[PDB]
UniProtKB/Swiss-Prot annotation, chain B:
The gene is KCNMA1. Belongs to the potassium channel family. Calcium-activated (TC 1.A.1.3) subfamily. KCa1.1/KCNMA1 sub-subfamily. The protein was initially thought to contain two functionally distinct parts: The core channel (from the N-terminus to the S9 segment) that mediates the channel activity, and the cytoplasmic tail (from the S9 segment to the C-terminus) that mediates the calcium sensing. The situation is however more complex, since the core channel also contains binding sites for Ca(2+) and Mg(2+). The lineage of its organism: Eukaryota, Metazoa, Chordata, Craniata, Vertebrata. The chain holds residues 418 to 652 of 1236 of the full protein. Residues 1-132 form the RCK N-terminal domain. It comes from Homo sapiens (Human). This is Calcium-activated potassium channel subunit alpha-1.
Amino acid sequence: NIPSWNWKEGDDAICLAELKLGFIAQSCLAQGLSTMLANLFSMRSFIKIEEDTWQKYYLEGVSNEMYTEYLSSAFVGLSFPTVCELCFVKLKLLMIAIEYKSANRESRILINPGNHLKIQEGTLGFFIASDAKEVKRAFFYCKACHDDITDPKRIKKCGCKSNVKKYDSTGMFHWCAPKEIEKVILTRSEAAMTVLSGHVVVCIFGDVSSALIGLRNLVMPLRASNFHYHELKHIVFVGSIEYLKREWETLHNFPKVSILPGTPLSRADLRAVNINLCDMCVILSANQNNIDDTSLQDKECILASLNIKSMQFDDTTGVNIPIITELVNDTNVQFLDQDDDDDPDTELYLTQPFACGTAFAVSVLDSLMSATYFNDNILTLIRTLVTGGATPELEALIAEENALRGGYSTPQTLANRDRCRVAQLALLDGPFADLGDGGCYGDLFCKALKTYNMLCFGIYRLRDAHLSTPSQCTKRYVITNPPYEFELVPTDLIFCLMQFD
Amino acid sequence: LESVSNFLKDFLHKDRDDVNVEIVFLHNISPNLELEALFKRHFTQVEFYQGSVLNPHDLARVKIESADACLILANKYCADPDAEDASNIMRVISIKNYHPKIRIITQMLQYHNKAHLLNIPSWNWKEGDDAICLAELKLGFIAQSCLAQGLSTMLANLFSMRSFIKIEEDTWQKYYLEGVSNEMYTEYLSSAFVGLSFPTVCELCFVKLKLLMIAIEYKSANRESRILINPGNHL
Amino acid sequence: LVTGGATPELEALIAEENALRGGYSTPQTLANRDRCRVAQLALLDGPFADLGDGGCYGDLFCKALKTYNMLCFGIYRLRDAHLSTPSQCTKRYVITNPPYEFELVPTDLIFCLMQFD
């Protein structure tokens, strides 16, 4: 509303709730993605680890950061997968997104564009690299001068020149007709005989006086029209029904929501939602207003997490259940994973629960607060990658009524949902199974990008993978952008940005 | 002030004979009034650490690893019993995280909260990690007082150190204090008692050894040996 | 002794739903309630009435344990018992584990751990 507030000039605002809930939701689709994104923008000192432990592999990807650089003139007229492969193989740079100008609006940030669209002269690609000088070398890349590149040091400055409401008005998100809370509320028995599986459970610690968490920002990314209707993950809220009634009017437009009126700490409610086989579990609190006990706000969250972990089921233990916990204090992260305590005085990123992605801290956004000063575009890329869209015109349309209005299926609407969705794939039974064991990461990335136009992201390697002892621990840690020569075991998940079909 | 006044008066009552002092103490809001209202009931012994229970550096300051136990006291006078219990569980969790191998004893204000201690993987109640629920036991003593009036007083004197004072006057106080000095202990039964029914060995202990045996442990090879209160002649 | 049971498995079952769920009568269930209950008995009209007056505590305890398998606990002696004045006060005080030679008046209650039948 401010006439002089020009976001194009650089005036951008960080919404702490928008981005926190978006990272949490993207963690549901890809476990550990919040930790991976956290290290892309925070300065974190690299410490060499001589021991063959998970910490060394984790810190290998921590030093990698995210930068923006204009693409060279040699890349004009080339498809995104080809230039991405050239940058990765030759320049050792991983390009994620670019800007496409349609001469109708502002150049949107296209996450992993396909081969349908080419690259114009004025493109500012987003790259991931440990240092900054490597990213700069992509600006003056010469195809003729640098045709043969034995090592990346060769490149230098010198060179040779129906009427059914299915989606919203813009089609960016799934939409459904508004429904009264009585259509989605349910009792223990109604939950217990429901066949829901691979769903998302969200436990809320909120009361009449607690503040709104703003759960809309948690629901929108989970259904951003990039997933099929059957592919959408069901969301079940466990908490006080009075609190849910406060902000239900902002969530009644989504197809798959359900609410169970009950305490998150109650084991009966969690068993009735069938949390044993749920795809993801999230713990949120809304009582951050309490002034007493400075380091005690994240009190019920750890109790709920331990209750979930220390819960048995009849055909197993609940430790294997993936849970995401919101922590307001970085000094209570170690209380989550009570299986390995290397040292009580440990860095937040080096802590195992944070590295595994099972714990998230709002402290992380205070670092994004700096990354947008040093590079203005980083916040826009993170927002468009996490929110799954949320164009400024869509933001305006939402602002005009504080709600989502359903649209109609039109050719432009159907073509609008052609972006990429964050997901994880395993090599145990996938097409790359032959490359799962004893295969270089770079070869796998090149094969995936050349075949399925899939941008192979970092590796969510299992913690007990390097050790030869058959450990039964299922906890895994994220490795951000492993090098070309890096090798991965078959029992490793890999993040990806899948296309739409 | 009250909690430490009643704890210290029993822990260091001088009726334990073969014991040391120990008590290190730890708090976060300091002993502002405690130092004038009572000090620590000793000057040379019993110290006070101004560091918190949650901070690992302060927990290292007390050398918790070298302690025999941590004892966690709770304010019965809390506004929210659930909050106080969850804070004490958070304390238990921090202590166990710093050192998995340590005995912890803990006051719980509500019974349903004791279940959360069993969620901690290193919390082994068989090793000795047991929690005292103040409401569980208070209401239990009150209820047992309904069945047997005065049972709460009898059980209170079985475990509290209380000095024995001789009363020459023929009053009820002398008879009452006669049974106050009696305390409760645990001892392994002799090999001569193996294969004998509980009433017979109890009679032998009472008549000969002047000892009153109440309960024993029976191992069924299926679970932990339960505490059988006055077993019959069947077993 | 106080909770009248409360086994750790039962505590876990209670913790799993924060409530009690009714079961069914089974031979193991019926045999489970074979423990002892705390109670009080008087010697005014009980089987030990002949031993109520001028009787040693130890003899009473031995007789009870040998006959009814009843663990004779301490004596809830009336406060105005030693005094010869016929006081009308009904207040009593607990005596914990009186010795073998201790003698009790007939108007005294005794704690006990009765069996089940």
